[PDB]
A paper describes a structure:
The exception, the knob of antibody BOV-7, will be discussed separately below. Interestingly, the antibody BOV-7 knob has very different structural features from the other knobs. This knob consists of five loops separated by 4 disulfide bridges without any α-helical or β-strand secondary structure elements, and four of the five loops are more than 6 residues long. Two of the four disulfide bonds are formed between cysteine residues in the knob region and cysteine residues in the stalk, resulting in three loops that are partially buried in the stalk. Therefore, the antibody BOV-7 knob, being structurally intertwined with the stalk, shows distinct structural features different from any other bovine CDRH3 knob described. In addition, the knob structures varied greatly, even when the same disulfide configuration was used because of sequence and loop length differences. Remarkably, one of the new structures shows that disulfide bonds can be formed between the knob and the stalk, and the knob structure of this antibody deviates from the common features of the other mAbs discussed above. In addition, the knob structure of one ultralong CDRH3 BOV-7 shows a novel fold different from others, suggesting that bovine CDRH3 repertoire might construct additional knob patterns to what has been recognized so far.
Residue numbers in the entry:
A (entry chain B): 2 to 9, 11 to 217
B (entry chain A): 1 to 186, 195 to 270
The structure:
Amino acid sequence: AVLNQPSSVSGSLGQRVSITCSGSSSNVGNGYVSWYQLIPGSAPRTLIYGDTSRASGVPDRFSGSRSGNTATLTISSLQAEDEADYFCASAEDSSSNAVFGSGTTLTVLGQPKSPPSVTLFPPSTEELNGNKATLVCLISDFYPGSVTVVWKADGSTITRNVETTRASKQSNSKYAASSYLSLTSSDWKSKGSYSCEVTHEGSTVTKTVKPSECS
Amino acid sequence: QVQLRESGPSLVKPSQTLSLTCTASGFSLSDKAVGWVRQAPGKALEWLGSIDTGGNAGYNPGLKSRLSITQDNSKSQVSLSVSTVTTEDSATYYCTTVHQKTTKQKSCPEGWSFADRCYYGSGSCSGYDCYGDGDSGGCGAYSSYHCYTCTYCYEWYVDAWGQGLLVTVSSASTTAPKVYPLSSCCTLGCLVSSYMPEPVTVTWNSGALKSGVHTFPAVLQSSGLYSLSSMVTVPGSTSGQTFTCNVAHPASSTKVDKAVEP
């Protein structure tokens, strides 16, 4: 399947950050974990292999370790260039089969923390007349630039036909994201409430629309 | 430094076969294998498979049914094939060089009844080589360095990564977007829905409003079509001004305006 990593991790300049990577005995338990750094617009960069070995050109700040079925990447002193996505990986009970982690977005703090402003838009009358219904959840003014979105229909999580953009920097240097839930005009009228739940730094902001009252 | 370049079509119709080629150069490519790793937008990296110098191929078990990887030694090219592609196969495909080595090392497996008297740790890749297989037979009443199991240690990591090649799977032709207003039930925006093949240019009030406007990146939806939104933040609590977004699609040669109001 996939190795579990925290979605986001943040720290100040010169501080120490750790990123966990938990799996099972057939992957991380094998004891040969690697770490990779992904910067947008650039090719992926290998940082660590074999739990603790550093690839060529990798600074001494990056280090790796493992305990049982859980591996950890550590950055002792953080710098501006360290901001990126970080993935762990390991072989899956064979040398030719490997699995990756879910990935962690690392932010070097450069401005105060800001919670997300969330607005859930109902489908327009014009779209409903075409027998369609798209819910648009627009998220803005949050920092660090990383959120997770959960769509709910009458208190039940739904994941079908859901698309979410990754955080994009605004003009004021804060970040924004968008999420879409595509429905038919019948699915829209068949539920009593829809909700968009945005989780940011362990805090959740929720907006809810009701197809009956919203008109 | 080993150079990797991905070649192939950017757009592939569903139910067809996705074919890609990687051009590998450099002396160090002989030692390590060449593999393929893909990542869908906003998703984790996914391992596809690899092929070594001798021509042996290994694949992701969950995808081996749809995967074929071959290599051309003379052109120093490695090819990938994904059969019967769906919209889920839209991803960025990386050509890579991969280190693969199976070794036998001393370890102390968990379910083993003599693991509590064994010094080499539970991890298979302990770093201490052994020969043979299984229980060493030297475990007694007390702990000893002769008490161990000779297990398989699977070493794997990607050495070098290519830049990647974004591939989109959709049967749609060039389609003009449909613009819908974004107004709260009780910030406003415009939804640019179901268009192909990017991009679309969004302005507000024919360019008279640009500050306080944030247009998002597009998403690729399960329909095979793109959708984005443009957002307007009104300052100063000034009320009673009409807002109109202008959407232009080059492929369809279309220009549409939609007024937004409560």
